[PDB]
Write a protein that binds this DNA or RNA. Structure first.
Ligand SMILES: [Zn+2]
Ligand SMILES: [Zn+2]
Lengths: 98, 56, 56, 92, 231, 56, 143, 118, 156
DNA sequence: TCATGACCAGAGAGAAGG
DNA sequence: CCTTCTCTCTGGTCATGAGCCTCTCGAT
RNA sequence: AUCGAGAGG
């Protein structure tokens, strides 16, 4: 389509670093029965840990992307009723402006 | 007539039978397809007359 | 479509075009109609080869 | 300035897009019978709005006039044939 | 990044729909026969059954999924330590343990990491896959749609050129190293390799290096249609 | 003409209301599970039949 | 007035701004620019180092890469700049050159030519990316 | 059903019969642990299930814009601010009944009339 | 239909019920296993009446099945037919009782009986065997109907 | 690529023995 | 009971195919 | 000639 563009590829390392510095508990320290309502966090299909109170994290991430501090072609998806947060910096994903 | 070892003849046969087969039929269960120059599968007498574009 | 709320079994939500060609289709109706017509194009593409093999 | 955002296929599974900015007008008859019938949005928790629905088409189909009044296979056929029409392809 | 070679991990629910023996096995890359999941977990340093199920069922009050997992634990009951799990391996003594240790970090979930000492991440991810499998088998989540566009990637000019150039540069490097071996007693960089390979692919449209089948992708590079501007 | 388009759009509106009634009736588990099919199948068939009736 | 909501007509303005900054083939250009600026270097620095052991050890490693502007070497001639129209007329290939920084270390070298990379037109290495409409007309390229 | 594990080994327990006293015990096969059963139910197998129909109900449910807002009141707090959805269960023979969640008191209610449970 | 017996939807429905295959799985809601060692008194307060009506004239493991009213009424099935079918299946190798059609719940209670040692003492078989018995009950129990006829509709 | 007869050794029912 | 044979359905890999005709160009 | 791509009814 006309306004259809394609993802080009970005480095996920700054994203993961920003996660671990904003309450994204690492995976080896994940106590499932001690933190049941914890939202999983994926970065390019890789589980990097869990996070509690993910609405604040999602607002911060969207604020950064809409500012430019994150590459606008990065996808950030919070699935609520699944308690998942998936971030894709993959190359080759088709997007469109809105 | 050179007096070759007993298992170099094994190689001679594994090559002769293979070549005669691929000359008759090149596409068989044996993974080797007997590629010609430029990686082209050797057209066999079988595939020559087999198929819609074949001889028949 | 992302323009509908979830679990919407409405007629227009699932592909009912209440407009006529004379009146003109809406974007959602347009996309659903195209989705339907593609199926007919693919059937026309596949049934041709199937019926060719059958006739042969 | 945070006014436009890129959305891929996976992300738009978590959003509710508006078709026109008029869907954001508050509701509160004498309609033209000739105008096509547009159902009310019946949804309010909007997060995005389409720039223009006509942007769902490609280069070929964007040449077709009134493609919303045509059987869709005809639009496919016209998209196929427009690549065979004669004309000035380049100035040089 | 690096060798983008594909490893296909399959977690198979070997139990039939109405039959008993609802076992769950896993497919490992260089391993002939499928392996039960609990043996893999205990090979990953997760010995207790409670911890294993904690890695799979992320809720205590979900007894259907736990009841589904019982035959897996009763299957792996025969192995109760890590070295015994690593010993269960398909080969032709002590070397089998090292072969399994190498497989569990080299070929098993390589997208997670290939560095030794990350078994917790892989165990949790395996539990996540099993959780998804059982959510499907319990008719709680629907079968994964395959034609969803978000699951599709469009390799554009960049990735294709990279796939080709990695191969061509590897061939150039191999030629340089063979020349160095040939020069043990005495600049021999065939630039024709890279240029000729790129040109062959860009011209014939066969994305490869003078190959027909291994470069099965044909029509990748096509003559620009210049009939009309819109064409 | 205007009268005919009025009757057409009123027919479509009454079909939409019919589908809404059937949908709300199904939402309250007030559907008779007739032999040989699920509730969702009966609902889908009823809605499709209503819409085809309206179109014709 | 400054903060009033837009109408469906004003959307076209945005659409205009979308293309005046991207054109219609932005996908191709962005993919290729990403490949040249970043991917090429990563491919070069991947298991590049070579080791040969005798009794000493000789190491050969590759450093930064450099991508020239598109040129051409005429037989019985010299290297000179290559423009697209000349390539389409003379059946040439609009390819630039690659030069890698190679260094040889020993136990206890200048830029080297490795080949030519075809250049996507209107990429950051194509002469037309910086060209004016008048420059295009003088280069016999359609604007 | 419930499930219990040995306190020392954290491995699952197996049922055993105390024949002389007609008791139910849960023993371990790692260590020699054994405990008294707190429920006679040993194995349940539902063929028709009502579990998971209200799956994925978290307090942030009000921030999912894809979910539709109804006009019903909450039977508890009478707040018309509520969301709804059909049964999250994905069996083909599933009732088309709506489940509403109040955005003011987190109470889950239903459009069902032929029954009212839980 | 039989010649002349047409235009009678009564016999039509009778034939339909007689031909449409019906398995025990199609009517079961849940299948539970309990340790209930006292035959004269159960730990379940609901089944009391069931054993109260059982006074005319094994294993402590109880296999308790619940049945769906809608599945039993969509067909022409009474609990007696299901009980006689399950008893005909195993031929006295297990004891079976059930509720009545009037009770709020449709229950079937089964226990194992080994002829050698369970006629003089209360020895319990491995609860792993009752699992296989439940598997055979849910997969290989033909209540009525024919082999592969999994649906039947009456048309005019 | 992939469904589907057409095949074709191996485990596997009976009868006969032991 | 238990082997032991003698033919037995039962389970699985394997070969085989895929609409006519027509046009243009391009690389080896 | 092979191999391949695109197109027509
Ligand atoms: Zn223990
Ligand atoms: Zn409330």
């Amino acid at each position: 389509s006309l306004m259809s563009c394609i993802s080009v590829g970005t480095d996920p390392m700054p994203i993961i670093t920003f996660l671990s510095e904003w309450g994204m508990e690492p995976l080896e320290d994940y106590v499932p029965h001690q933190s049941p309502d914890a939202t999983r966090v994926f970065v390019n299909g890789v589980w990097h840990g869990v996070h509690r109170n993910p609405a604040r994290l999602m607002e911060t991430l969207r604020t950064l992307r809409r500012k430019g501090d994150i590459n606008p072609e990065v996808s950030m998806i919070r699935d609520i009723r699944e308690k998942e947060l998936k971030i894709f910096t993959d190359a080759g994903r088709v997007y469109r402006p809105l | 007539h050179n007096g070759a070892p007993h298992h170099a003849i094994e190689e001679a046969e594994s090559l002769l039978q293979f070549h005669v087969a691929t000359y008759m039929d090149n596409d068989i269960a044996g993974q080797p397809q007997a590629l010609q120059k430029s990686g082209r599968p050797v057209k066999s007498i079988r595939a020559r007359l087999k198929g819609k574009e074949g001889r028949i | 479509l992302p323009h509908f709320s979830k679990d919407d079994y409405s007629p227009e939500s699932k592909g009912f075009v209440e407009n006529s060609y004379l009146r003109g289709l809406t974007p959602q109706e347009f996309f659903f109609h195209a989705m339907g017509g593609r199926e007919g194009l693919i059937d026309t593409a596949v049934k041709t080869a199937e019926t060719g093999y059958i006739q042969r | 300035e945070g006014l436009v955002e890129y959305i891929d296929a996976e992300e738009e599974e978590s959003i509710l897009i508006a078709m026109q900015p008029e869907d954001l007008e508050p509701a509160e008859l004498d309609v033209d019978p000739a105008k096509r019938i547009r159902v009310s949005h019946h949804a309010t928790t909007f997060t995005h709005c389409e720039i223009h629905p006509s942007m769902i088409l490609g280069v070929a189909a964007s040449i077709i006039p009134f493609p919303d009044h045509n059987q869709s296979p005809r639009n496919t056929y016209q998209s196929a044939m427009g690549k065979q029409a004669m004309g000035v392809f380049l100035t040089n | 990044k690096g060798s983008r070679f594909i490893s296909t991990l399959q977690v198979k629910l070997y139990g039939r729909e109405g039959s008993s023996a609802r076992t769950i096995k896993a497919t490992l890359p260089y391993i002939k026969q499928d392996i039960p999941i609990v043996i893999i977990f205990r090979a990953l340093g997760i010995i207790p059954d409670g911890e294993i199920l904690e890695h799979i069922c992320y809720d205590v009050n979900d007894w259907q999924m736990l009841e589904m997992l019982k035959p897996c634990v009763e299957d792996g009951f025969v192995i109760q330590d890590r070295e015994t799990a690593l010993d269960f391996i398909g080969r032709r003594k002590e070397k089998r343990i090292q072969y399994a240790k190498d497989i569990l970090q080299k070929e098993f979930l390589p997208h997670i990491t290939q560095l030794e000492g990350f078994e917790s991440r892989k165990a949790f991810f395996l539990g996540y896959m099993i959780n998804r499998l059982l959510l499907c088998a319990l008719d709680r989540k629907d079968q994964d749609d395959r034609d969803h566009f978000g699951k599709k990637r469009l390799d554009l000019a960049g990735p294709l050129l990279a796939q080709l150039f990695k191969t061509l540069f590897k061939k150039l490097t191999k030629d340089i190293f063979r020349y160095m071996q040939r020069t043990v007693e005495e600049l021999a960089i065939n630039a024709k390799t890279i240029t000729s390979g790129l040109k062959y692919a860009l011209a014939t449209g066969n994305w490869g290096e003078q190959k027909k089948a291994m470069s099965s992708r044909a029509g990748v590079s096509q003559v620009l249609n210049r009939y009309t501007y819109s064409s | 003409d205007g009268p005919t388009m009025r009757e057409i759009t009123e027919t479509i509106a009454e079909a939409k209301k019919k589908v809404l009634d059937v949908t709300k009736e199904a939402q309250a588990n007030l559907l008779t599970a007739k032999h040989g099919m699920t509730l969702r199948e009966s609902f889908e068939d009823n809605v499709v039949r209503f819409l085809n009736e309206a179109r014709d | 007035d400054e903060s009033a909501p837009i109408t469906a007509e004003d959307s076209w303005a945005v659409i205009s701004a979308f293309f005046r900054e991207k054109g219609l083939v932005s996908q191709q250009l962005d993919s290729f620019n990403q490949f040249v600026d970043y991917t090429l270097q990563d491919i070069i620095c991947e298991d590049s180092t070579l080791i040969l052991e005798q009794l000493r050890k000789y190491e050969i490693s590759f450093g930064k890469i450099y991508v020239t502007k598109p040129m051409v070497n005429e037989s019985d001639g010299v290297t000179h700049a290559l423009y697209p129209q000349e390539a389409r007329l003379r059946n040439l290939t609009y390819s630039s050159g690659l030069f890698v920084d190679v260094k040889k270390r020993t136990y206890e070298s200048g830029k080297v030519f490795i080949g030519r990379l075809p250049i996507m037109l209107r990429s950051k290495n194509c002469y037309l990316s910086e060209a004016t409409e008048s420059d295009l007309y003088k280069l016999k390229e359609c604007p | 059903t419930t499930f219990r594990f040995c306190r020392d080994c954290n491995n699952m327990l197996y049922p055993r019969e105390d024949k002389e006293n007609n008791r139910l015990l849960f023993e371990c096969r790692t260590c020699s642990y054994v405990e008294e059963a707190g429920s006679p139910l040993v194995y349940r197998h539902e063929l028709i299930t009502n579990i998971g129909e209200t799956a994925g109900v978290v307090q942030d449910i009000g921030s999912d814009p894809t979910l539709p807002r109804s006009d019903r009141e909450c039977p508890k707090c009478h707040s018309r601010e509520n969301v709804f959805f059909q049964s999250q269960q994905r069996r083909k023979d599933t009732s088309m009944v709506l489940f509403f969640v109040c955005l003011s008191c987190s109470h889950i209610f239903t459009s069902d009339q032929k029954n009212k449970r839980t | 239909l039989e010649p002349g017996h047409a235009a009678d939807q009564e016999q039509a429905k009778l034939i339909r019920s007689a031909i449409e295959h019906t398995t025990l799985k199609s009517v079961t809601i849940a299948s539970e296993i309990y340790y209930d060692p006292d035959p004269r008194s159960t730990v379940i307060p609901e089944d009391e009446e069931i054993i109260q009506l059982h006074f005319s004239l094994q294993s402590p493991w109880l296999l308790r099945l619940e049945l769906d009213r809608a599945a039993m009424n969509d067909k022409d099935l009474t609990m007696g037919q299901v009980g006689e079918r399950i008893k005909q299946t195993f031929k006295n190798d297990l004891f079976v009782i059930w509720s009545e059609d009037n009770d709020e719940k449709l229950i079937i209670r089964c226990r194992v009986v080994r002829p050698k040692s369970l006629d003089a003492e209360t020895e319990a078989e491995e609860d792993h065997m009752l699992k296989k018995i439940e598997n055979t009950m849910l997969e290989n129990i033909t209540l009525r109907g024919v082999e592969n006829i999994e649906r039947v509709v009456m048309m005019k």
